[PDB]
From a paper:
A major factor that limits the expansion of shrimp cultures is, however, infectious diseases from viruses, such as P. vannamei nodavirus (PvNV) and M. rosenbergii nodavirus (MrNV), which have inflicted heavy economic losses. The Nodaviridae genome comprises two single-stranded positive-sense RNA that encode the capsid protein for viral capsid assembly, the RNA polymerase for RNA replication, and the B2 protein for host RNA interference suppressor. While the shell domains (S-domains) of PvNV and MrNV contain conserved sequences of 62% identity, the protrusion domains (P-domains) and N-arms show low sequence identities of only 17% and 43%, respectively.
The final atomic model of a capsid protein in the T = 1 PvNV-LP includes residues 64–368 without the mostly structurally disordered N-terminal region (residues 1–63), and comprises a canonical viral jelly-roll S-domain with two four-stranded antiparallel β-sheets (BIDG and CHEF), a linker and a P-domain. A structural comparison of one subunit of T = 1 PvNV-LP and the subunit A of T = 3 PvNV-LP reveals RMSD < 0.2 Å. The 30 spikes on the outer surface are also readily discernible. They might be mainly involved in the homo-dimeric capsomere interactions, resulting in the A/A dimer with a bent conformation with angle ~144°, similar to the A/B dimer of T = 3 PvNV-LP. The T = 3 and T = 1 PvNV-LPs have the similar structures of the S-domain, linker, and P-domain, but the N-ARM and N-arm of T = 1 PvNV-LP are more flexible.
Residue numbers in the entry:
A (entry chain A), B (entry chain A), C (entry chain A), D (entry chain A), E (entry chain A), F (entry chain A): 66 to 368
The structure:
């Protein structure tokens, strides 16, 4: 078994809600964060969790630090329920949901402008849980679920109720794990993202290619270029709008043909930047008399 | 320091080239594979290498297994040059490039239908190299570069020359590392990929949405949907082609407006599958009398 | 090796910026301070670092103390990236830049009115870095770069956004180093400074020298006197403006000749003060009938 | 206490004077060098001495090496008087000043073409002396004063008197100190220096700026630019001489206005070089028809 | 690691320059010799350094022995700067460049007719430097650079200035290294040299070959013969100048055809000598009536 | 004594000859390779052997690896005769030469498609042999001579005779030596080589020099440039062919003067490349109207 840690990991922010925004006792739950190893998308532990099969938090002490002044006050209670199918979201009594919160071991009751810690209590046996995204049963792959309950109305410096929502802190983990059995573990968790939208150049000479240089991107990362344009009237003048762009080093072609007899808006470009964060592509137009702009999107895997 | 391993990693295939395809002594180099921790895109070690700053192969024994029968023969030589700026690609003598290959320590000389191993010789000091993609100088972040040289013409069962290229084996690592100083290490290495191209449905009723169910994808992975169509004549009949698709659960919109007065082909959809590998989206057309098909691409981060 | 410390060193102030002043995720970086031994110009460690070749922070724990009351609140995160070419200034996601901040080892997450410390994590080998100003590669001479990221909008006592910039604290180091190999290490870091601008006296008698005594300077420090005057009409009356000043003890002459046939405004004076912080110079004018004032600047090396 | 050393330090040269140049017995003293830690301006020890309060030479053995051949001869005597207010410069007998020199402990009597050493004798108590420039009393901050006396007329290869002064050797220290109580110790000892004098370019176009590139300076050091010109007749042709120079990166402006109605010759420029030792500044002239040259001085702190 | 030494190696001679030949303080540097293992072309250590990747001088004490009498005198200072990018060639003060020389550890100050030694101070870590010719950064492959500064004007037996340059000594190393990781290390350092120029014989009989025996060469070394002739008028008589020379044992042909219709002056001969230092070649002329001499050059790799 | 190894060294290839190509029993000897330390020109050991006087193989196990398939068969026998003047090349019986081969100790009898090793048996005394090229007697400087004898006709997959020669394997050493008494050992073994033949440019302007840039050479290696041209008719038009080329940095001149009154084709150029493998030279022609091409050869020491 490969023992890793201790490090930190950013889970979420927590939005303490106003006294008028709480209607049912199920509405008091501010965060419901699973503490599986594969449920913090983008952090250090979730990128590591898809390279072993099993894991076990030896000590995953959740750590709250506030972002709120010392002139507003509200009491929280914070626990880690080790039974991932027990659910406090269907308890109809507001005093019952907070007796259920303090009764859980390791719970810790704080004013929400104070840094306090909640440790995860390990199970008496040497039980390993599966990593990765969740299959059929949650009890194979979640060791705990982190809750925060609001027990008091959000008060201010004069004894009055704050009537607006207020993002109040951040939850940081401090983990220590035993991974085991290295498997590259498919159904990856890297979510792609539209990085930015930047348009092509407007060339002068018909049929002669030009080099367009885009700047301000990450150094030496592979991107994916998809064409998409917004609200262009290609029939405001004569000619056929034909745009074909290729990378000078990468792979793929983009064909933009706004001929209404045969219309083709397709293609993709795979190209990585240089060490400065730039890449260049050759754009050629058969009819350069048309000056309608055309954009393209930058798709990248961020985590 | 976190000691990891031992495991295996698939580097490349190796294409043993014919006797007529070798012209200069620089052409004998079959593979030039850097043995940095961040230069095997998609494997286990490269996914792990961007979560620590430094690394050191305590034992990275490269292991060749063949995929060629016992009736063709060719002698290889295989070494790991620990000086990543020394380059054998500019040596003009064919006998010099193979005396330079056997003189390197840890080199191993095999017939190419035989499984033989080449160990990486560590440096006498306790020197750590940086992970991640390479910056200015290669000697900060490459511990070795793996070469394979072809020293004999590719012969067959009767003593004659094979005149075609022949993929012959595969290179597997057996690594053992000391990582250190956990940093999430930006400029990620996850390259995105066009997964498959599948088109929208052809609905019957104008203005009433329908649910399109795409199957055969990975379970519980986040995708990115980009619109692109190929060679459609939207002016073969009357009407305005307006297609708007939204996910029922995810995020984003796709607008396909083939009005030649204002043309908008844009948008993206972020949506993840269910546990069966399917996801569904609501497609509505204002004018359903037009039966031109429209496609969309599936962008996903694969590693 | 000469082991020095522990002492303190003033790095910078940190200007926590308002919620409207943050546009891109790269704008959240408040300070980007290199923690090389030669990158704190004027402190104790940078004056010492140019008298040895190498250094290694055994413990350089950065220490934040606030200068802001307990009625405004904002959460910081603070880390020391040991890889001086990894750059978080080109990450396009605001949640990614703060997961990258907490994942770094030794990071520490605080409300910005609270004194918290961030230790520098040493590298597993015994690696020495060069001192002095940076040459070609930064990884030879920077052991870490200190960042501070703002993760929460700057809030006040009532839950409202502060709309102005607010200098909030100060960063103090607590260092402990092993220097080695004494070299006086050229390209010094002492920046000169215009100390103050004070003008000459207006003497009465032509051709007879007078002693001008300037007060209020540092005791027993060598200065440099350069002549410069502002907006004088020397042709408002007759005569030739000739001013020649020499120190009574130091070195150099200043010649001020406003003859429009041959104009000479040049010279410098090197003279040090006495133990009281004063020095005196002999000023003689050939034509004292002209009462245009003439100034001179005081150049001094401050650190 | 921080124990430093052993290293070397260049004190001075020593000019052995001729037999006709010695008139009084006080004239035999060749060098009178204080051996305080802050009295060798520019060396290694004086740059280090202003970063602690106290010091004590455990062994500061002064070391003479000659620069004179073996064909001229003269006997020296060399001692270190530990009482910095005892003065041998007011002893009227030439035989008394050399009995006073050999009687001092640690004195060493050599021919002046021979390398001999003089050790500093420490005081029987554990007495620390203050660093920095000298205040009221010298006995708080000087541990010794180094003398060299000439006891014999300067003779040559044939037994005749050399009648000219002759620089003969150099004095090198070999020190070993205990510093204590780190204080950054104001009234710094870095003396500024006119580096070189270089003039502006003569531009062609009026009102359009040009870039002047000065080369041959130290890499990555901050300078100070002061304007000063020598003997220019600005009324040899028509026009108003207006020169305004700014750095492209640094700080400050220089205004040169030779209008005799309002004359302004002022300003300073703070700018540092690049890694090649060059810096560039933008020079613009309102009236470029005047071709009088104008210079500027380069002020830099050298030690 | 293979520990080698101790042996000696001849670095250079050193030309002490006259008092009139020193203009700038950068001109005082007599030698600037890098002390890399691959920067003494022709010695023992540089021939050995291209057969391992790394090296570390455990003790490389530079040793000066003079070649000048005891009747001229000049003081040197000699140090080994361990930071190969620190450069004293851009320091504008002549007293600063010699305080920077004595402050370096291991420096040693001698009269230049005296044998003195300068040891190389090793770095506190176990750092190995690359061998071979220098790549991008010098700090990977130079452990030190050897300087010698002239601090005193070159004086003679009577106290007068020598006005001519004077080669004065020689610098010998005394090394002790740890090499590691045997690699044959391309881009070899063996520089070829025109050994001597000797011409062909003038044969009598047309079309009958003769044996030309060249003597006075190195025994059993492979040479390379290239044809080149100087100022021959081949049209002073009738006939066609055709000369073809082959070795009797070696490889290659030389064709000398001075036909102005088709002119061919080409070819090379590879042939090694016998154990006596001679080799013989067959020279045949089709038209022996022409008595113009023709030469050939002897190319050999000397180190 | 300096103990080196163990490493590998490429000796030769071995050409197994057909059944019809064997006539006399002396023709069965495939390789006759001396195992002196100075008889593998270009390898690691021969470059090291000319830097000590003596050597002794403690273990020089010769290692055969085949390059032939498993469908042809032939039996070899392989031994190392420690008596370098005993010669099996004058034994008239084919069965005697193979009884003499197996009787030698350390001999090893293999099918020629199988990797087998032959160890060198050391002599019972501690006898050192001289390095370098061989003088008068071979028994001072050869410890062994490696033979391979073919004992069986070369057969194929069906029991028939292969009638063509077939290069079959390669011989690799695995050495371990004690060198002694460091001497730089003259009559070097570096053989020079014509690298490539590339011609001059054809300039346009008479008398104005142009810069010719040759690419594709080894980085930072010193070359030697010799002029040689092939079959040029310089009298096809008017003018005098005068070509003079100099390096911009190196040493030497080439003069090409095709004046038939005084003809000079001579000169050499010594110039090294930059770090990219290129060098440039200035070519000037007095009469550029002549467009006959002229070549030059590149001489380099390869090992």
């Amino acid at each position: 078994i490969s023992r890793l840690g201790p490090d930190s990991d950013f889970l979420t922010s927590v939005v303490a809600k106003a006294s008028t925004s709480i209607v049912t006792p199920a509405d008091r739950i501010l965060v419901k964060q699973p503490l599986s190893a594969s449920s913090f998308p983008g952090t250090r532990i979730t990128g590591l969790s898809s390279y072993w099969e099993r894991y076990k938090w030896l000590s995953a002490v959740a750590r709250y630090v506030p972002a709120v002044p010392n002139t507003v006050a509200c009491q929280f209670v914070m626990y880690i329920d080790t039974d991932p199918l027990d659910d406090p979201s269907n308890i109809s009594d507001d005093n019952q949901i907070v007796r259920q919160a303090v009764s859980q071991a390791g719970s810790n009751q704080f004013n929400f402008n104070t840094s306090k810690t909640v440790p995860l209590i390990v199970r008496a046996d040497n039980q390993y849980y599966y990593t990765g995204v969740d299959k059929q049963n949650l009890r194979f792959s979640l060791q705990g679920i982190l809750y925060i309950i609001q027990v008091t109305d959000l008060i201010n410096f004069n004894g009055e109720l704050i009537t607006q929502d207020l993002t109040c802190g951040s939850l940081f983990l401090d983990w220590l794990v035993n991974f085991s059995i290295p498997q590259i573990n498919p159904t990856s968790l890297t979510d792609v993202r539209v990085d930015k939208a930047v348009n092509f150049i407007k060339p002068e000479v018909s049929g002669v290619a030009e080099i367009q240089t885009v700047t301000g991107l990450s150094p030496s990362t592979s991107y994916l270029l998809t064409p998409a344009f917004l609200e262009q009237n290609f029939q405001s003048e004569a000619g056929i709008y034909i745009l074909s762009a290729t990378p000078v080093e990468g792979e793929g072609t983009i064909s933009i043909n706004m001929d209404p007899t045969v219309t083709t808006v397709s293609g993709f470009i795979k190209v990585k930047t240089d060490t400065f964060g730039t890449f260049d592509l050759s754009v050629v137009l058969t009819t350069a008399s048309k000056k309608q702009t055309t954009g393209f999107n930058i798709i990248a895997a961020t985590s």
